[PDB]
Every structure is written in structure tokens, then in C-alpha cells.
């Protein structure tokens, strides 16, 4: 695989033509009004969410990625293809590492690495893994997870699904209460998937719901000189051994075809094999 | 026929108020909680908590809404189907002060239940069941319109009875902060009070792991009413005079009712189980 820097910078210019990535990355204090009604990107337009004093107080003053430039970025998905890959060292060598859905690293360091600079957080994760922060034990566990992220950006898409509404109110309340006690940088994208989906429409990727991986590649494109993908592999067998794989390392086929095409054209390095 | 025994009632009142500080228990107040304080739920495992936000606290009253209030005749109106066809409306509205349970509707049922409302209770689960969690403009407007019709009534919201109220409390709180100043409704939010209430009534032979909103209502009423009349308390699905079937609720626990019937017997209160004059 050889990196084609000119093709990549060209892809970047095309992306930024269709998506104002720095702006789209997160709402800012002055980009919303108290009382404003947000709609949900992937839900009926009739669903709304009112912006409280408190939600707004949790937004950044300027985009967390304004004037940031990193040389090598790793974007790490959650496929089982990472299990036994020993990609840990190669991933941690990167200048900036994106991860998906609050994925765990402590017990998987050798394969996925421990360095984290941005991680995505669907608010449904409170419900599934932290019991809606209903007990002291859960509130402490959540606090502790967030402390381990140090100064990483936590990218919370609250306005994708209307089913994230009630949990958004629990998160917001938790973050206000613990204001000043965490170095984690919150980022809250608004209604951005129409604009993101337009760029990728012209590259014949269609689907109902664009994946977090393609979305990550899109952000990464604005701030990384060179993107390497790890853990993107939708199928439940290994591509070299053909032995079975766990669906996720810690236990869509249209998207992956596209990334493999891009790997072919030297835009990015998709890694599907053991590292060391 | 029923005769009011005023001396027996005033005796019951003095006994209640000796064991329950009703005026205090009625609602938390701004200065009675701290931002960050963890509330527990009276009828749930002690492990469940709710943190008091800036916003929750801003919605509490500065003093108890029933401090130094005294009414002559109080009606306490439950929701049993026994009210259907009863024409109790006029007798209920004649009262000086009317308590109602669980945001019960009156517009379509005036002749039987009355229209006058001075306090109504509100389990926050009602947002999920009838207002779709305030998720749409239509639901937010419907809720706003219901609250506007209560004018200056107290809305008594027991947020800390069941842990399953937690998420919907956060939706209410947010709704009320957003609409601050636009409603004359007087919010009241009782804290952890059922230990103290249930202990007075333990010695009167009523046990349960959940006390009923009606007994709770009688307890509050006792602190501010000279004479209490109960309407719509009747747990069974048949009429006591005709024996024909009844809807469970007029708008569609047996231990508690036994107790209220005993009290009716002793002239403390008038339980009404029949058509009104
Ligand atoms: C609802 O009304 C209640 C009165 O019916 C309020 O209860 C009072 O609340 C205060 C503040 O929490 C308590 O003050 C404490 O007093 C005890 C004294 O020991 C007592 O132990 C039990 C009480 O259950 C009993 O044996 C005697 O009352 C004893 O005197 C101290 O340990 C504390 O430091 C503190 O000063 C009152 O004791 C308490 N009264 C009763 C009868 O329990 C209650 O706070 C109200 N709740 C709300 C939300 O308004
Ligand atoms: C940004 O990163 C690029 C590319 O870095 C390369 O690939 C990464 C994924 C990692 O594996 C890196 O370890 C690896 O360097 C950097 O460009 C590279 O710079 C180095 C010099 O530091 C170049 O190597 C030299 O080449 C000359 C002539 O061929 C030799 O005489 C030298 O001894 C030495 O080997 C290399 O050509 C160049 N690589 C590419 C693909 O262009 C870049 O330095 C870095 N920038 C910053 C500011 O960090
Ligand atoms: C995401 O960026 C898009 C694209 O730049 C923004 O869409 C523009 O919004 C402006 C308002 O400032 C419109 O007048 C432009 O016509 C839009 N341009 C395009 C190409 O659609 C959008 O505001 C951004 N969304 C967020 C949440 O930041
Ligand atoms: C990207 O994230 C990692 C956190 O995982 C940052 O690396 C840490 O930097 C601190 C502060 O100097 C060190 O004390 C830690 O030992 C580093 N941890 C690891 C795991 O390497 C890194 O600095 C961040 N980089 C950028 C550009 O934000
Ligand atoms: C009203 O109720 C009171 C209290 O229950 C009655 O007064 C008691 O009457 C009994 C006789 O059955 C006496 O032995 C008690 O000493 C009285 N109690 C007190 C505290 O004085 C009263 O009789 C009732 N009135 C009516 C009309 O039934
Ligand atoms: C409290 O209300 C009662 C009930 O209406 C009042 O006493 C009654 O007064 C009416 C008419 O004024 C009479 O027809 C009843 O026969 C009375 N009943 C009894 C048992 O005395 C009482 O005066 C009211 N007190 C107030 C307004 O202070
Ligand atoms: C109890 O509630 C009713 C409202 O349900 C109050 O009665 C209203 O009072 C206003 C202003 O005094 C009148 O203009 C309305 O016509 C009355 N409505 C009804 C239905 O009677 C009553 O004042 C309240 N009682 C209190 C606070 O003691
Ligand atoms: C990528 O670089 C090659 C040289 O490797 C160049 O000729 C080509 O035009 C670039 N872009 C595309 C789209 O192939």
C-alpha cells in the first residue's frame, strides 16, 4: 500500500465543499438559543427537544477542532478482526486516535491500544451499561470511565434518534452537577447528517443510516494529513484464516466496500491483518 | 342518616398533627434542599437516587403552600366509577376546597364530579401514559393547556415515591423551567414523607407496602379542613345499591376503603356511596 497524498488532499477539498466540518463537528454556545427546538436527523420531524440553560452551558465556545492538525490519525472501529491483531503499538504511534461508542481499551490494549483522543457516545449507552445513572454505584462507574479519558473529546450525537431524548436529559444533568471536575471535552453535533450524506451520495453509498465509521472518516479528513483505519470488517470470519470472529472485539457491507475502494486508490490504509 | 361528630374529628386532627408535621411534609421548599443532595424513593430500594439540580430547586416554593390556610368544608374526590351518574357535581362544588387525584379530568364529567379544583395530585408517570413524554409540539401544547385550566390550584407532584418516576421528573422539571412565569399553577413537591405518614396510620390497623393517595389526601385535608367529605372512593366493580357493573374509573385497594368506612361510621368524615340529593 502506498499513500497517494495528492489524491487524499483532493478528497479533503471535495469533502469540505459539501460539509463545513469544523462547524458541523459541534454546536457552540452562540449557535443555539435557550428555548430553540431541535429536530432529530433520523426520526419523524414531529419529535422535538428544547434547549435548556443547562444544555447550552455544556456546549463549547469554539469548535474543539478549530486550528488542529494532526499528521497520522487512526480511526478504530469495533470489529472482532482486531482480536489477536497486536495493532496496539501501531495505533498508539498515531498522533490522534478516534474510537467508536465508548469502546473499552483497558483489557484490550495489545490489540486496540490505549491512546484515546476522541470517542463517540450514543446516549443509549447510559441505559444499556450504566442503568440510567440511577444509583450511586452507576454514577461512580460513569464518573470513573470519564476520568480515564482525561482530555479526550467526547462526541455525543444527541439529535440522531428521538429515543435518545430522555437519556440526554440525564447526561446533561450529570454533566452540570459534575462541572469543573473532569477534563473531558464535550462536543455535541447538531443536525448534520443531511449535509454529510450529500457528499457520500455521489460516491454511490446510499443507506438508511450512514455508519459512525464513515462519519468518523469524514471528520478525520478535515484534520488529519493521513488516515489509517483499523477494526472495519463487517463479516464474522477472518479474511486470512477464515476461522470465526466475534462480531465485536470486546464480546454494514456497503460501507466497507467503499473503504476498500479508497484503500485501493491510496486515500487511506484499511488494515485487515495482524500488525506485529 | 350520617351525623358529623365534630368533637371526635377535632380529636383525630389533634392526634394526626402531633405525629405528622403536615404543613412541613406537604412540600419541599427552596431552603430545605441543597443543590447536589441525593433524594431516595419512599417505595423503592434505597439504592436508587435522584440528584437535586439548580432547576428542580428553582421550581420549589419558598414557604409551604398550605401554611395558615383554613377551610370549612373540604371535598376529597377519588376516581372510582361510582361517581358516574351520581350528580355529585353541585354538592362537590359547594365545598370551600376540593382535592382531586391524578390529574383527573372534569370538563366532560362536571355534572357527576364538579369543575372546582384547588389541589390535584400528579404522578409524573402521567406524562408517559397520556402526553407521550412531551416529545412533540402537539403533546407539549396539550400539557400546557391542561395546566392553564387549573388556574391557581396547587399541583402536588410526588416525585420521590417510585424510582420509575426518575426520567419523567427530568422532563417535567425541564418543561416547567422553560415555561416559567406563564402559568399561575402553584407547584408543590413532597419529599420523603411516607415513613412518617404510614406510622400514624399503622396503629389504626392499615398495613400496606404502598399507602393509597386517598388516605394521604385525607391526612393533608385533616390539617386544613374543618369537615371532610369523601367522594369517589369505592374499590369494587359493582354498584352498592343496584349491583350493576361499574367502570373502574369514572372517565374510562380494599384495605383503605374498610378504614374510611369505619371513620364514616364514627362520624369523622362523610363517605358518599350513592347518588347526591
Ligand atoms: C415530615 O415531618 C416530620 C415530623 O412528622 C419530620 O420529622 C422530623 O424531622 C427532623 C429533621 O430530620 C427530625 O430531627 C431529628 O431528631 C432526631 C431525634 O431522635 C428522634 O428519633 C426518632 C425520630 O424518628 C424518635 O425516637 C424521636 O423523634 C427522637 O427524637 C435526631 O437524631 C436528629 O439529629 C434530628 O434533630 C425529627 O426527629 C423528625 N421527627 C420525627 C417524629 O420523626 C420530617 O423531617 C418531615 N419530612 C419532610 C420531607 O418534610
Ligand atoms: C508526517 O508523517 C509523514 C509520513 O510518516 C511515515 O508514515 C507514518 C504512518 C509513520 O509510519 C511514520 O513513522 C513514517 O515517517 C512524515 O514524512 C516522512 O518523513 C521522514 C523523515 O522524518 C522521511 O524519511 C526519511 O527519508 C529520507 C529520504 O528518503 C532519508 O534519507 C531519511 O533518513 C529518512 O528515512 C520520509 O520520506 C517521509 N515519509 C513519507 C511517506 O513521505 C512526516 O515527517 C511527518 N511530519 C511531521 C511534522 O511529523
Ligand atoms: C453544517 O455545515 C453546513 C454546510 O456548510 C451548514 O449548512 C449551511 O448553513 C448555512 C447557514 O449558516 C446556510 O445558509 C447554507 O446555505 C448552508 N450551506 C449548505 C451547503 O448547505 C450547516 O449550517 C452546518 N450545520 C451545523 C449544525 O453546523
Ligand atoms: C491523545 O490522547 C492521549 C491520551 O490517551 C494523549 O496522550 C497522553 O498525553 C498525556 C499528557 O502529556 C501523557 O501524560 C499520557 O501518558 C499520554 N497517554 C498515552 C496513552 O499516550 C495525547 O497527548 C493526545 N494527543 C493529542 C494531540 O491530543
Ligand atoms: C362522638 O365521639 C366521641 C369520641 O369517640 C364520643 O364520646 C365518647 O363516648 C363514649 C361513650 O360511648 C365515652 O365513654 C367516652 O368517654 C367519650 N370520649 C371522650 C373523649 O369524651 C361521643 O359520644 C360521640 N358522639 C355521638 C353523637 O355519637
Ligand atoms: C361551615 O359549614 C357548615 C355547613 O354548611 C355550616 O353550618 C350549617 O349552616 C347551614 C346554613 O348556614 C345550615 O343549613 C346547617 O344546618 C348548619 N349545620 C350545622 C351542623 O351546624 C357552618 O355555619 C359553616 N361555618 C362557617 C361558614 O364559618
Ligand atoms: C378553589 O378553586 C376554584 C377554581 O376551581 C376557585 O373558584 C374560582 O374563583 C375565581 C376567582 O375568585 C372565579 O372568577 C371563578 O369563577 C371561580 N371558579 C369556580 C369554578 O368556582 C376557588 O376560588 C378556589 N378556592 C380557594 C383557593 O379557596
Ligand atoms: C493518485 O496519484 C497517482 C500517482 O500515484 C496520480 O497519477 C493520480 O492521478 C492520483 N489520483 C487519482 C484519482 O488516481
Swiss-Prot record, chain B:
Its main location: Golgi. It is found in: Golgi apparatus membrane. Autopolysialylated. GO terms for biological process: ganglioside biosynthetic process; glycoprotein metabolic process; glycosphingolipid biosynthetic process; N-glycan processing; oligosaccharide metabolic process; protein glycosylation; sialylation. It is an enzyme of class 2 (transferase). It catalyses: [N-acetyl-alpha-D-neuraminosyl-(2->8)](n) + CMP-N-acetyl-beta-neuraminate = [N-acetyl-alpha-D-neuraminosyl-(2->8)](n+1) + CMP + H(+); alpha-Neu5Ac-(2->3)-beta-D-Gal-(1->4)-6S-D-GlcNAc + CMP-N-acetyl-beta-neuraminate = alpha-Neu5Ac-(2->8)-alpha-Neu5Ac-(2->3)-beta-D-Gal-(1->4)-6S-D-GlcNAc + CMP + H(+); a ganglioside GM3 (d18:1(4E)) + CMP-N-acetyl-beta-neuraminate = a ganglioside GD3 (d18:1(4E)) + CMP + H(+); a ganglioside GM3 + CMP-N-acetyl-beta-neuraminate = a ganglioside GD3 + CMP + H(+). CMP-N-acetyl-beta-neuraminate binds at residues 79, 102, 212-214, 234, 248-249. Keywords: Disulfide bond, Glycoprotein, Glycosyltransferase, Golgi apparatus, Membrane, Signal-anchor, Transferase, Transmembrane, Transmembrane helix. Pathway: Protein modification; protein glycosylation. Residues 1-277 are lumenal. Expressed in fetal and adult brain and fetal liver. Glycans are attached at residues 5, 25, 72, 118. The keyword RNA-binding does not apply. It comes from the Eukaryota. Disulfide bonds join 74-225, 88-276. GO terms for cellular component: Golgi membrane. GO terms for molecular function: alpha-N-acetylneuraminate alpha-2,8-sialyltransferase activity; identical protein binding; sialic acid binding. Its EC number is 2.4.3.-, 2.4.3.8. It is a single-pass type II membrane protein. Belongs to the glycosyltransferase 29 family. Homodimer. Catalyzes the transfer of sialic acid from a CMP-linked sialic acid donor onto a terminal alpha-2,3-, alpha-2,6-, or alpha-2,8-linked sialic acid of an acceptor, such as N-linked oligosaccharides of glycoproteins and glycolipids through alpha-2,8-linkages. Forms oligosialic and polysialic acid on various sialylated N-acetyllactosamine oligosaccharides of glycoproteins, including FETUB N-glycans, a2-HS-glycoprotein (AHSG) and alpha 2,3-sialylated glycosphingolipids, such as alpha 2,3-sialylparagloboside and ganglioside GM3 and to a lesser extent NCAM1 N-glycans. This is Alpha-N-acetylneuraminate alpha-2,8-sialyltransferase ST8SIA3. It comes from Homo sapiens. The gene is ST8SIA3.
Amino acid at each position: 500500500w502506498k499513500f497517494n497524498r495528492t489524491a487524499f488532499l483532493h478528497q479533503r477539498q471535495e469533502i469540505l465543499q459539501h460539509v463545513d466540518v469544523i462547524k458541523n463537528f459541534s454546536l457552540t454556545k452562540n449557535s443555539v438559543r435557550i428555548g430553540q427546538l431541535m429536530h432529530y436527523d433520523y426520526s419523524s420531524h414531529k419529535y422535538v427537544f428544547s434547549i435548556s440553560n443547562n444544555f447550552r452551558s455544556l456546549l463549547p465556545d469554539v469548535s474543539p477542532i478549530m486550528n488542529k492538525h494532526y499528521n497520522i490519525c487512526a480511526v478504530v472501529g469495533n470489529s472482532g478482526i482486531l482480536t489477536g491483531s497486536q495493532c496496539g503499538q501501531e495505533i498508539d504511534k498515531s498522533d490522534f486516535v478516534f474510537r467508536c461508542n465508548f469502546a473499552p481499551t483497558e483489557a484490550f490494549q495489545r490489540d486496540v491500544g490505549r491512546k484515546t483522543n476522541l470517542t463517540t457516545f450514543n446516549p443509549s449507552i447510559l441505559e444499556k451499561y450504566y442503568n440510567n445513572l440511577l444509583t450511586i454505584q452507576d454514577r461512580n462507574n460513569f464518573f470513573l470511565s470519564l476520568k480515564k479519558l482525561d482530555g479526550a473529546i467526547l462526541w455525543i450525537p444527541a439529535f440522531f434518534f428521538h429515543t435518545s431524548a430522555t437519556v440526554t436529559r440525564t447526561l446533561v444533568d450529570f454533566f452540570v452537577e459534575h462541572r469543573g471536575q473532569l477534563k473531558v471535552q464535550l462536543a455535541w453535533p447538531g443536525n448534520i447528517m443531511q449535509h454529510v450524506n450529500r457528499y457520500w451520495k455521489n460516491k454511490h453509498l446510499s443507506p438508511k443510516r450512514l455508519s459512525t465509521g464513515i462519519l468518523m472518516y469524514t471528520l478525520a479528513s478535515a484534520i488529519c494529513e493521513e488516515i489509517h483505519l483499523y477494526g472495519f470488517w463487517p463479516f464474522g470470519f477472518d479474511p486470512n484464516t477464515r476461522e470465526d470472529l466475534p462480531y465485536h472485539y470486546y464480546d454494514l457491507p456497503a460501507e466497507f466496500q467503499l473503504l476498500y475502494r479508497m484503500h485501493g486508490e491510496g486515500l487511506t490504509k484499511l488494515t485487515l491483518s495482524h500488525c506485529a
